[PDB]
Amino acid sequence: GTEPTTAFNLFVGNLNFNKSAPELKTGISDVFAKNDLAVVDVRIGMTRKFGYVDFESAEDLEKALELTGLKVFGNEIKLEKPKGKDSKKERDARTLLAKNLPYKVTQDELKEVFEDAAEIRLVSKDGKSKGIAYIEFKTEADAEKTFEEKQGTEIDGRSISLYYTGEPKGEGLE
Known part of the structure; x- marks a missing residue:
């Protein structure tokens, strides 16, 4: 504040x-x-x-x-x-979010930690990363447990972070 x-x-x-x-x-x-x-x-x-x-x-x-x-x-x-809190986060947590990534980062790169993950989706525009990475795990239990244990890895020389976020409603409603 x-x-x-x-x-x-x-x-x-x-x-x-x-x-x-x-x-x-x-x-x-x-x-x-x-x-x-x-x-x-x-x-x-x-x-x-x-x-x-x-x-x-x-x-x-x-x-x-x-x-x-x-x-x-x-x-x-x-x-x-931003981040919030709600019972809806239960399923909304199925997907994890990555931050602190270089403009040259790639999908496989971050996959070096969550290679066992279900699916990977990087966010890049104009042929370059934007500093984020969305990944859809099989279960919030396997995701929040992987990003919480894998968190701290080194990629491109820097240390990429790991967080969870499913965003508010409207994703499928609208």
């Missing part, structure tokens, strides 16, 4: 890493202001490539996820939802 004023916030990314820290918040809240949105407070990470956006109510917050055409400083920001 020690920044946001409301409990309503969303995980944003692709805020361009060229301008200053407080120089990004402006644009972020700007683009939204054009979509009839109102932000109470905006936060930016240390890498100046991602951050969070706080909204007065869940309406404006969820609204941003509905609308489209969000970009600042030329680049197109990415809206997403």
Whole structure:
């Protein structure tokens, strides 16, 4: 916390890493202001490539996820939802998420740890990684147990992390 004023916030990314820290918040809240949105407070990470956006109510917050055409400083920001907690996570945990991966990382690479996994799905655009990797295990028990034990491996010289996330509803409903 020690920044946001409301409990309503969303995980944003692709805020361009060229301008200053407080120089990004402006644009972020700007683009939204054009979509009839109102932000109470905006936060930016240390890498100046991602951050969070706080909204007065869940309406404006969820609204941003509905609308489209969000970009600042030329680049197109990415809206997403942070980690949460709910009984739905039971099955939603079937799939694990990977982070701290290089722009040259590959599927087989991360598979070096969860090679026994069921399926692997990397996230790369323009012919380069984005810093993430989604994998669908056979069971949350075999997944959360593999990412919790394998976590700490070394790939491309760096140490890739491991986390779990199934995202909120709407995945199959909508």
